[PDB]
Each structure stands twice: as structure tokens, then as C-alpha cells.
Design a binder for these strands. Structure first.
Lengths: 176, 136, 75, 119, 131, 124, 92, 96
RNA sequence: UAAGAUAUCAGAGGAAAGUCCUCUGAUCAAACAUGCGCUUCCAAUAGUAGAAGGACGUUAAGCAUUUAUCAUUGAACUAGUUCAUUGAAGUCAUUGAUGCAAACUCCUUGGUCACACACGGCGCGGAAGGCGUGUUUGCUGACGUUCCAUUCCCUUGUUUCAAUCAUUGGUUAACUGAUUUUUGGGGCCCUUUGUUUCUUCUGCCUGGAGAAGUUUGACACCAAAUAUUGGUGUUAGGGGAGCUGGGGCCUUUCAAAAUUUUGGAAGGUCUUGGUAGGAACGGGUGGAUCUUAUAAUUUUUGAUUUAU
């Protein structure tokens, strides 16, 4: 007999094709997509709880650290730490999905932009994406002069929220 | 082409290839110390990565990979050989170390927001086109 | 046991390496469970492209104990 | 008949498996598999010296001898001692079994007698 | 004839422990190769430049300490003045060492060559130390 | 070094960092995870180690040091045809007692899933 | 056997090869059958004397494969669970 | 076929077939010469054989010769009892 | 891909030959216990160390070497060499590759345990084997069906001393030992890094706290499309009572043999393990192994000792 252990279910009618109908079935794909999403975070979320080995401290260092004053520690509340871990987890999700693609935005009206950045129609990748519009025929006859009320200004540089109040308050020149 | 104002996405390749490939994790701190001093368009994506490391530093030995044993004790006055009850001491070291990042984020941000607001905002065309193209 | 699925390959020009050094390009007709393969208009490739290259025969069948790789040089 | 079923009864004996390479393996034998996967214990795997005024020995086997991690640095001649070596069957050329054991007790296969006694 | 203090206790086998004791004393010595070890009988040298035999008990009284005998008394001191009270360290710990109050046990075999009553004496007192 | 169990077959020593030899004189050293009828095996974090042709004159009979050129390749599936022998290198990260503990908690947790699945399939 | 069942778990991910001739292919793995023979798509092929090329589609007799290197996140796919609890099968 | 049918077939091919040369050499206590694909030959007496052509031998005398730039030597190695894997052999003759 | 099988041997018994089945021996194996003066290993603090393994790290363009296409046509040329043109293929590299060696830096691992600073064992562990007895079992695991099953308490910085309080025992109200409550003093740890990392909720470094809960359940987390459904994981550690298994020892009772040995029953003492599932039975049940199809190109019945 045969079964798929992501779904945990046995196949009802065993043939080769019923397997392939289950192997590329919508239900089964959503399981195996979700199964590896759980094993991804679990290696990171279950952080290596290391084992400590405490040495018997010296007579010398015990006197040199006694004269040194005891520093204050900061412990947050349970309600506080449940929110701050909700934030810091959601922040690391953002740094995954940045993908800084300003450079594609800069060469928009150039003479080979269809052939290099559209990426349905390169050579290296182009045959593979057609399986799984802005065509390759585009030349520099259409849109001769870019600035004819068409172009958008460059989106300004991003900044950190936490340190949003380090910015100089006034601009040097008067913008419109 | 490292100081190119739009080089942001070049370094993101280079940092992808250190983490992925190399084992030690002393080059990844060494390179990222450079990107912090350059006025790139997207610099805040590189301070976010520095601040995600500093927080995840969990032992005092891991502050040696940032900067030398001496320059820690002189410029900030924190010691790695401090044997004691470390928890608050490393919680202090971070707060003292995170500060001089923030003063560097004050330095670069002035240089970026100058260059963006004066020059780079206005320049609408960064490519060649042809000998028949005319610029504004 | 199972037949190798080269169903998408057939009738395209195909280079393949016989044992070690010899390379044989032709148009793939048929195949079997052992990967013994038969192809039309064969030509033995070498270092000098027109010079040392010579044609083999109208139909030739290769034993699957000497196929290493079989690249499909067409769509 | 399978004569590999003879080897299974030869268990806890000193033996020399001698491989296709030319590498001899002197050791204490354990469970031989049906495909002749012999698995030894207190072993000493070596290469002989084909003398003939420095004829070069097996180049591949010298590499595989050092790689095992058993060759000690001050081994002057080419030997390597270790515990536990599992050996894939097809590589066995010979097996030099010891002088003491009697073949006549062991070469009587049980499934040979159990076919004739049953008929 | 010499007597050490605070040596590492833990390597429990004698042939293995004296390997470490020979290793820290003389790097690139005879025994950093590991085929075989010499064993002189009660009544040959281990390493060059003075060394002959080492001796270590497991008893609770002679715990971290270990006797050590040389070829002669001047060479035994010549080893102590090789370092000249600059404390060298085996595995991890700095050794403090002095001259042995009791004479070297195999040195007496060398001295009287230059001894059954001593062997009679050992049996008698150890029976009384048993009491 | 490490003393392996005197009667321990290839099924027993899962998680033991092995030292597998192929026919060409190249060795793959890693944690074993599966095996098979015809003895092809899945190592976890293996490293191929090769003695280069230049170093090989040094192993001919006369402390020797050999420059072994190695390359990392994590999680392989070897082939049987190629294996020549195996030898054991390290022992697993978890104890013998602790590998029984993790079995019984997982044997308990696996059974709990089925009964929670069967009663979620029965009524709905 | 798990060694082969793993290779089916790696469809549509980048893998490597090493054919017993001493080549090294590394491209996305499209098909595999039970005899460990594979079809790779969009590959980079390294000849035994170092020469590298690119070929769109390749088939290899499984008999000549020396090893396959798989993505490292399948190290904890459920082939490797020791104690598994399958439900009672449906009646045919 | 059945399991009993193959037992008849195996007894035939050992008795009335090509391997009858080995089987008639085991019974009659006649020494054989064997050539392995090693290119060295063993002069021995057979004590058992099998399907795969592997065989247990007794009073083995191997005779192996090697050459390196047209310089020959003939080495002789004696063994009491040996077990020979069957793929190695290419030709078995039966001595007169 | 299929079929078959689930240790072997020997004896007695049931339906002259063999098969089927059953209890009695031997041998073999697994699991579990449990022993051996069994074997090996388990890191400074009386100090700023060190052992094993790395670095796909640096010094470093180190030092020492050797390498950068072939064919066709003309000119000059010695009697090979350079220049220009035409064709063929062409991993990148020359800060390379190959050989030699050192120094430094940094990473992962552990009993950084207890007692002692004392002229060739028999401290309490943990890790890894070898060897020996005993019991169970004879491939192993879910699932169903009838049955046997059937507990608690304290603690989650730790240790030590002092103060008092309470309880129990010894002896002539007093003394002593054990245990518990409130305070104070001292020692060590707090990286527990989400400040105890069994959950949830409250909460903290001038403190180690408080509330609720514990498996047909609860909690955490991930995924969506417009609350729901589908997935992964957590539910712990320490001590004591009980209850029960195994081990050694002692005394008693009994049977055999010539005061002793061997076996069985009970009580006492030391030590060690378990403490919520277990038995029978049942299936067109799962997986392991074994034999044969299978020595005929895709693994194991030879094309890697470079050989004439």
C-alpha cells in the first residue's frame, strides 16, 4: 500500500495516477507548503539553550569585583514582554521582504529595459518563466522624450521610526 | 562602484554571499561596519540589520567581533574579562554600544538628506538613451 | 521495472556521451526500460567541428550501459 | 544452495579478508550478511609491498588507507589499525580462513539435508 | 629523587598519565608517538636529559602529588635549576616542587650497585601500617 | 578513541558520525540518517576528503603530515555501488539514556495525534 | 528505502550531482524515478578537467550517479521520524 | 515454477552441465588450476562450490608474477584453507 | 515487482513413509534487570590557564617553484627565430595553481563535582565499551473486542549560622537529638540574557514574589482567503510517603546429600529500579527481517592495483 505522510492519510484507490493526482492536489500542496513553514521557524524560535559550567571563582577576582559597584538590571512585565516579542518578531519578517529594487526603477525608459529587467523574456531565465505585458519588441521610438508629464519623482530615502527625531527639523532651501 | 549613491542593492548581494557561504562570521561584521559610514539611498536597511545583530549578541566574548578588546575599554569603558554577574553588565554594554551607532545614524542621515533634497531628487534620468536624446 | 520518461524528448536533436570520450548526436526515435536508445541521422562529434566529425548510418541503436548523460539540444 | 550460508557459521574467528584493491584486513569477524557484507572488529588493514626494486604500489588504496583515520603518524611501513570496519561484499576477493576449524562439520548445509530428509 | 605538587589527578591510567607528564616536561620527546613504554623492574631510561622513572599512586594521601626519580642527585637538582624556581605548568596548573625527604626507591638500586633487608623492611612496616 | 558496540550493525548506529570510503579514494565523513538493502546512505553534514596527487608520494613507505583538500557538501544521498567500506568516527550528541527518553516522549506524542485526528474525523 | 524516497522529496529544488566520470551538474531537479535517474532543468555542468558550460535540459542514467547533494531543510522531513503512528487503513 | 522445481534444476546443472567439471573435480579428489581476473593463478583442491562459482579450497598455492620495465619475478604464497569469491574467476581447468 | 516465511536442533506424544501439531532438553537471538577491587574517559582558580576538534580565518602579492593556445599563407633570417594576415576551438584565474613553514585571532565540546595541600587504589556520579548470571520473549508496533487496572504530599535561587515559636523521643521543671513556622546575619548563583525557559495572568535588581491549571485537556506559535479551517510544538525538573520489581546479606523453619553444601518459605537490614497502564482474544492491519524468483545492461557475483 501507499500513503502521504504530510497529509497522514492513505490513498483510497491505489494506482500510479491517483498518486500523481494526490501529489499535485490542491489540498496536499497546502499541507506541504505549511509543513515546511513550521519547521523553518522552529529551528529559529527554539533557540539553543546552552548548558553552563560554573568554575569556582578565585580569591583574587572576588575582591576586585567586590569593590566594583553592582549595576542595575531592567526586567519588563509579562504584559510588556508579550508585546515587545510580538513587535520584534514582526520586524524580522519585514527584513525578509525588503528586496531593495531601486535600480530597476531607475532604468525604466532605457534602450534594453525590456530585454534585461522584465525577466519573462531574458535568455537565461526567459524560457523557464513562460511555463510558470511589456514585450521584447519595444524600441526607443515610443516615448522619445521621457519628461513630458510622464515621469514620477524619485521616492525619498527611508528612515528608522525609533530614531525619527534625530532628523534636522528645517530644510536648507524652500521646496514647493 | 561601492560609494555609488544607489549602491544599496550591490552590498545586499555581497552580504548575502558572506552569510550564505563563509563560516566564521567575523567578515560579516567587518563588511557591515563599512556600509554604516557610506551615504547610500537605502542606508536604513543596513542600520536595521546592525541593530538586529546587537540585540542578538548573547555573550561578552561576542563583542570582540565588533571592535578590539582595547578600544572597548578606552572609548566606552566596558570589559570582556569582567567575570561576575554579567546579565546587567551586558545589558549595559549594549545600551552603551547602541548609542554610538545612533550618533553615526545622526551623521550619515545629515549627509543623505542633504544630497537627496538638493541634487538626487531633481535628476530624473540616469541612463544613456542615444546621440539623438536631449536632456532637460 | 519502470520505463524512463523521455516522452517529451523524442524527435528532437540530442547529444549524448558514449562511455567516456565519444559523443554522438542524432534525432531520437525510441527508447526502452534499460535505456538502450535508437536515433536517426547520427554523427560522431569530435574536437574539430567539420573535420573529424563523420556520419555513422541511417539508423543506429545504442546500448544503455554506455549512456552517461543525454542532453536535449532543442526546445 | 548459498555458500554465503557457510560464512555465517564462521562467527568469532580470526580471519583475513583480502580485497579487490589489494588491501588485506586481519581481524575478528562478526555477522556476515546474505550479500557477504563482512563486519569485523579488532582489525589491522595493510598493503603488501610488491618489491621488484620500487614498483609503485596501489595508488588509490594508499589514499583510502590514510583516510580511514586509523593510520598512526609513526607507522613506518604501510599499515593502519582501528576498531570496527564494515565492508561491502562485492569488494571481497578472497577470505583466508584459519587452520584450526574443521570444514566437515561446517560445510554440511542444513537446507541441503532438510530437502533430502523431507522428501 | 624529586617530589611534585598539584599535578592533574584525572588521567587514571599510569602509562597514559606519564605520557602527559613526559609531554609537558620535554616537548618533542621520545613518547609523543605511542607504540610502547619501558618498564624497569624493582632492583634503561624513560627520556633523555636526566629522566629514568616516574611513580604515581591512587591513594587519598598521595593524591595530586607524584614522586619522580632521575639518574643522579646532581642531575635531579639540575632539572630544578633548569627552571630555577620559574614555575612551569603541566596540563593547566603551575607545579610547585622540592627535593624528596625520602630517597629515590630505584636510586637505592643504583646506589648499592655502586638489598633484601630493605625489601624485608617494607613488608614489616606495611603490615604495621595496615594495623 | 571511540569504542563501538562489538556486535552493532549499520541499523544500530544512526546519528554516529561515520567515515565512509568510496572506490576512488575519497571519504565522506558525516552523521548517518538512513540506509538501504543495497547499502546507499544519507549523511547529514558530510565533508569529502581527498588526498591530492602531489601529496601521494608522501604516503609511500620510507611524523607525516598530509594536506587533505576537503570540501563541504551538506546532506548528501550517496550511492551503494560506490561504497567500499565504513568506519566509525564520533558518537552521537545525545546520550544512550537520553535517546530512549526522546523515543518514549515521541512515541507518546505520535499516538496522541491519531486519536485527536480519528475523533476529529469521526463526528465531523 | 529512504535514500531514494528522499530524492522524490527534492523535486523542483536546486540539487547537485557528481557522475562517476567525475563531472558535476547543478541545476533544478524536475524528475526522478525509482532507479535514482534524474532530469535536471537549467543546469551548470562542470567537466572533470574544470571546464564549465550551461545546458537547458539534461538526462542522466542513474547508474552513473556518485552522490546527490540536496537542500539542507529536508534534513527534517518526515521520512526520518523513527516512531510514526499511521492510522488504520480504509478497506478495499 | 515452484520451489521444488528449482531444486531439481540446480541438481541437474551441477551434475550434467558446464559446472560438472567442478563437481567431478570435488568428488574425485583431483586438483584444479584457477585463473582469477587478478592475473594470478592458484593451484588447489576443491572442497565445496556454488551457483555463483565461489568455492572453498584447501591446500592453496597461489602463483603471482609482476613486472616493472621488463624486470620479472615469480612469487609463490602458500595458504592452508581459503574462501574464494566467484566473480574473480575466468577459467577453471581440471588437471589430468 | 511478486510469492512464500517469522530461530535452529534433538528427543516423547497425537492425526513402514513423510507432513502437520504439542510438551521436554540443548544451542542461538532480542529486550529488560543486575553484578563484577573489570576496561577507558570526564579542564587553571593556591589561577588570567589548558585538552580535543575546527576555521569553507588572518598574516599574505609570505617564502620556494612551474605554468598561459593550434593550423594555414608572405617577409626577413641562421642552415631553428621574429613580424603581419586567414581559420579552428577557448572554466575562471597568474594578487593564480603546486610544494614549505610558522605566528596570531576566533569558533564548538566538557563534572570546569566532593574531600584533601597531605613523602605503585578500593569517595559520590555521568559517558563509553568488554565480560557473567537471572527473568521475560521468540520479528515488532499501532487498532478493535471482554477483562484486569484504580494512589498522594511538599518544593522551582541555593546553602549556612544565629535568634525565637511549635511538634515528637531520651533521662533526671532542666538538658540533649530530629523536624516545622517568623526574623536577622553570612556564603555562593541569577546568561534565568522573553531575569526560572512546566504553562497562562500579575510582577521584579533597595529582589528570588503572588494568583489560577495540568492530557479525550490547556497553552504557544505558523498559514491563509474573506470569526473560522488546516499544520508544528510544549505539557518539565527535584525531594519525600505509598505501592511494587531486581540485587547482596543476616536469623529462623523445612527437603536431599555426606557439623557442612544445595533448594524452598518467612522476618530483619543494606542497595537499586519502576510507579499508569497491563492480559487475553480478534482481524482481506502497518512496518522489520529472512528464502526464492534475482549471477543477463540501473547498486551485491567484478572493466579503476594502468599494466602489453
Amino acid at each position: 500500500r501507499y500513503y502521504c505522510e504530510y497529509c497522514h492519510s492513505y490513498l483510497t484507490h491505489d494506482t500510479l495516477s491517483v498518486r500523481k493526482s494526490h501529489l499535485v492536489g490542491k489540498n496536499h500542496l497546502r499541507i506541504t507548503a505549511d509543513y515546511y513553514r513550521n519547521k523553518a521557524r522552529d529551528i529559529i524560535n527554539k533557540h539553543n539553550h546552552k548548558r553552563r559550567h560554573i568554575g569556582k571563582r578565585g580569591r583574587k577576582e572576588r575582591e576586585n569585583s567586590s569593590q566594583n559597584e553592582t549595576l542595575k538590571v531592567t526586567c519588563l512585565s509579562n504584559k510588556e514582554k508579550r508585546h515587545i516579542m510580538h513587535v520584534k518578531k514582526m520586524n524580522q519578517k519585514e527584513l525578509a521582504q525588503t528586496s531593495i529594487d531601486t535600480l530597476k526603477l531607475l532604468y525604466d525608459g532605457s534602450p534594453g529595459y525590456s530585454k534585461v529587467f522584465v525577466d519573462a523574456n531574458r535568455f537565461d531565465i526567459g524560457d523557464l518563466v513562460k511555463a510558470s505585458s511589456r514585450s521584447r519588441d519595444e524600441t526607443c521610438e515610443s516615448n522619445p522624450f521621457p519628461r513630458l508629464n510622464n515621469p514620477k519623482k524619485l521616492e525619498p530615502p527611508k528612515i528608522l521610526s525609533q530614531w525619527s527625531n534625530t532628523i534636522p527639523k528645517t530644510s536648507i532651501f524652500y521646496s514647493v | 562602484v561601492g560609494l555609488h549613491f544607489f549602491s544599496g542593492e550591490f552590498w545586499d548581494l555581497y552580504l548575502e554571499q558572506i552569510s550564505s557561504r563563509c563560516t566564521s562570521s567575523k567578515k560579516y561584521w567587518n563588511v557591515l561596519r563599512k556600509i554604516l559610514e557610506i551615504p547610500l539611498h537605502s542606508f536604513s536597511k543596513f542600520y536595521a540589520l546592525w541593530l538586529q545583530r546587537i540585540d542578538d549578541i548573547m555573550d561578552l566574548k561576542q563583542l570582540s567581533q565588533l571592535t578590539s578588546k582595547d578600544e572597548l575599554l578606552k572609548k566606552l569603558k566596558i570589559d570582556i574579562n569582567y567575570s561576575g554577574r554579567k546579565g546587567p553588565y551586558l545589558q549595559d554594554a549594549k545600551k552603551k554600544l547602541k548609542k554610538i551607532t545612533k550618533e553615526m545614524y545622526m551623521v550619515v542621515q545629515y549627509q543623505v538628506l542633504e544630497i537627496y533634497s538638493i541634487f538626487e531628487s531633481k535628476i530624473y534620468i540616469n541612463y544613456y538613451t542615444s546621440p539623438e536624446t536631449l536632456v532637460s | 521495472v519502470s520505463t524512463p520518461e523521455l516522452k517529451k524528448y523524442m524527435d528532437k536533436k540530442i547529444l549524448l556521451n558514449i562511455n567516456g570520450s565519444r559523443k554522438v548526436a542524432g534525432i531520437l526515435r525510441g527508447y526502452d526500460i534499460f535505456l538502450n536508445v535508437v536515433l536517426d541521422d547520427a554523427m560522431e562529434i569530435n574536437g574539430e567541428d567539420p573535420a573529424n566529425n563523420h556520419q555513422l548510418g541511417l539508423q543506429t541503436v545504442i546500448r544503455g550501459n554506455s549512456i552517461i548523460s543525454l542532453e536535449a539540444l532543442d526546445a | 544452495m548459498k555458500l554465503v550460508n557457510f560464512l555465517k557459521k564462521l562467527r568469532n574467528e580470526q580471519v583475513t579478508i583480502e580485497l579487490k584493491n589489494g588491501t588485506t584486513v586481519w581481524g575478528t569477524l562478526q555477522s556476515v550478511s546474505p550479500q557477504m557484507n563482512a563486519i569485523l572488529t579488532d582489525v589491522k588493514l595493510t598493503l603488501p609491498q610488491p618489491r621488484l626494486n620500487k614498483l609503485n604500489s596501489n595508488g588509490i588504496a594508499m589514499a583510502s588507507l590514510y583516510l580511514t583515520g586509523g593510520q598512526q603518524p609513526t607507522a613506518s611501513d604501510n599499515i593502519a589499525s582501528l576498531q570496527y570496519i564494515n565492508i561491502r561484499g562485492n569488494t571481497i576477493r578472497q577470505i583466508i580462513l584459519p587452520d584450526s576449524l574443521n570444514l566437515d562439520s561446517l560445510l554440511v548445509d542444513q537446507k541441503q539435508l532438510n530437502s533430502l530428509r523431507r522428501s | 629523587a624529586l617530589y611534585f605538587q598539584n599535578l592533574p589527578s584525572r588521567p587514571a591510567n599510569k602509562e597514559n598519565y606519564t605520557r602527559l607528564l613526559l609531554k609537558h616536561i620535554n616537548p618533542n620527546n621520545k613518547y609523543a608517538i605511542n607504540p610502547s613504554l619501558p618498564l624497569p623492574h624493582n632492583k634503561l631510561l624513560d627520556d633523555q636529559m636526566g629522566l629514568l622513572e616516574v611513580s604515581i599512586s591512587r591513594s587519598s594521601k598521595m593524591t595530586n602529588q607524584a614522586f619522580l626519580t632521575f639518574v643522579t642527585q646532581e642531575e635531579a637538582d639540575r632539572f630544578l635549576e633548569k627552571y630555577t624556581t620559574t614555575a612551569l605548568k603541566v596540563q593547566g596548573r603551575k607545579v610547585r616542587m622540592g627535593k624528596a625527604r625520602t630517597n629515590s626507591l630505584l636510586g637505592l638500586s643504583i646506589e648499592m650497585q655502586k638489598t633484601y633487608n630493605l625489601d624485608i623492611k617494607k613488608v614489616l612496616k606495611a603490615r604495621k601500617l595496615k594495623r | 578513541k571511540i569504542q563501538v558496540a562489538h556486535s552493532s550493525r549499520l541499523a544500530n548506529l544512526i546519528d554516529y558520525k561515520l567515515r565512509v570510503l568510496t572506490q576512488d579514494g575519497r571519504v565522506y565523513i558525516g552523521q548517518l540518517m538512513a540506509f538501504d538493502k543495497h547499502m546507499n546512505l544519507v549523511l547529514n553534514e558530510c565533508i569529502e576528503e581527498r588526498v591530492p596527487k602531489t601529496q601521494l608520494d608522501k604516503l609511500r613507505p620510507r611524523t607525516l603530515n598530509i594536506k587533505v583538500e576537503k570540501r563541504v557538501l551538506g546532506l548528501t544521498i550517496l550511492r551503494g555501488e560506490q561504497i567500499l567500506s565504513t568506519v566509525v568516527e564520533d558518537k552521537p550528541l545525545l546520550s544512550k539514556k537520553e535517546r530512549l527518553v526522546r523515543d518514549k516522549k515521541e512515541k507518546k506524542q505520535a499516538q496522541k495525534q491519531t486519536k485527536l485526528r480519528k475523533e476529529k474525523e469521526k463526528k465531523p | 528505502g529512504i535514500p531514494v524516497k528522499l530524492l522524490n522529496e527534492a523535486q523542483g529544488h536546486i540539487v547537485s550531482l557528481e557522475l562517476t566520470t567525475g563531472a558535476t551538474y547543478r541545476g533544478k531537479l524536475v524528475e526522478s524515478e525509482d532507479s535514482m535517474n534524474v532530469q535536471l532543468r537549467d543546469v551548470i555542468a562542470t567537466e572533470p578537467q574544470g571546464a564549465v558550460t550551461h545546458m537547458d535540459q539534461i538526462f542522466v542514467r542513474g547508474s552513473q550517479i556518485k552522490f546527490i547533494v540536496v537542500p539542507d531543510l529536508l534534513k527534517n522531513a518526515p521520512l526520518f521520524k523513527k516512531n510514526s503512528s499511521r492510522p488504520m487503513p480504509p478497506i478495499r | 515454477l515452484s520451489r521444488a522445481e528449482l531444486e531439481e534444476l540446480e541438481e541437474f546443472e551441477f551434475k550434467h552441465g558446464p559446472m560438472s567439471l567442478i563437481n567431478d573435480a570435488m568428488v574425485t579428489r583431483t586438483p584444479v588450476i584457477i585463473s582469477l581476473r587478478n592475473n594470478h593463478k592458484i593451484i588447489a583442491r576443491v572442497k565445496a562450490f556454488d551457483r555463483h562459482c565461489n568455492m572453498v579450497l584447501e591446500n592453496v598455492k597461489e602463483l603471482w608474477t609482476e613486472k616493472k620495465g621488463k624486470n620479472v619475478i615469480n612469487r609463490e604464497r602458500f595458504i592452508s584453507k581459503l574462501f574464494l569469491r566467484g566473480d574473480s574467476v575466468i577459467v577453471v581447468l581440471k588437471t589430468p
